[PDB]
Design a protein around this ligand. Sequence first.
Ligand SMILES: O=C(N[C@@H]1CCCS(=O)(=O)c2ccccc21)c1ccc2nc(O)cnc2c1
Length: 337
Amino acid sequence: QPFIVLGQEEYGEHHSSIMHCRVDCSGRRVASLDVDGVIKVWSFNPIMQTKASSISKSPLLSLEWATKRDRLLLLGSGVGTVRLYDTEAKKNLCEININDNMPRILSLACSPNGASFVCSAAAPSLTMNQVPGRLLLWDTKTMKQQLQFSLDPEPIAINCTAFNHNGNLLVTGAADGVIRLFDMQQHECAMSWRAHYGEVYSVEFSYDENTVYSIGEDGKFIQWNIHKSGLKVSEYSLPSDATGPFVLSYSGYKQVQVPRGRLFAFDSEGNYMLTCSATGGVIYKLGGDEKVLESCLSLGGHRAPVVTVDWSTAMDCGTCLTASMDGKIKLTTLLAH
Ligand SMILES: O=C(N[C@@H]1CCCS(=O)(=O)c2ccccc21)c1ccc2nc(O)cnc2c1
């Protein structure tokens, strides 16, 4: 027992499958988005209560908290817009159009220092996600686009983005299975490699930033050497219910969700990793020698597939979010022993 479970509550205000659920930078608020475009903002400590609720007219694909004003939330649409939402005032501060042919704002990342954000903007899916896309750098003070990064060999949909701790690096994963690491001072690709067969779904820097972790359509979780391009440190085949596609099956009818939100999350020091499963979050210890990753804690509590997760620590206490296709979000409190 490397953690103690202080409890597990349920936030049940969403009536459709969850797309995203992220804890804010203060560690006090959750922003969750379902597939019907409903955005909810809610606290949970010490009880669950809803601070804001709204139906988007436009489809919403992405969500990201601002780093230097806890209350601000970036939202990316399926109609080529990024909107800044004030969760305190409960109104949009602005909405910027992407003057382009790329309506799907698949990913948003706010820089740690608060001065910039990036978004990915992709062409429509094919009647596959092997479609063009762009990666945009913005200035947060003006909320204007500053530049877009060229993608090698071709424009491609970027699914996931993450900054390192200082913000000088940005790691991305794309629909072509390639990870691209950007130097955000020189505005160039410092490094790229083929990571997965099929799409990359999530990317993250290790706590120490000597590696990046990725998870992709081939069901692999891989850890890469950040100093040597494409060199693996470790590799695991996760259970297929870690990567989906996620299926909720009356008869005849089924719902199918491909990974869109964060598939993995980490404790504050990057020693443990939360993943999706059919019945709840499954936590692994990182850094082990074992050739097969063994589950060290199963949070359970779900009656439908978990499709996205988060893990936040504040006041020296961990909060795990697990979100499922029935729209339920379990919030599990963990203290480290
Ligand atoms: O809050 C504004 N920017 C902040 C910049 C400080 C750092 S932050 O708070 O972390 C952050 C993070 C992410 C986006 C913006 C900001 C902002 C700017 C320009 C605007 N222009 C309009 O037309 C309307 N609303 C506007 C609102």
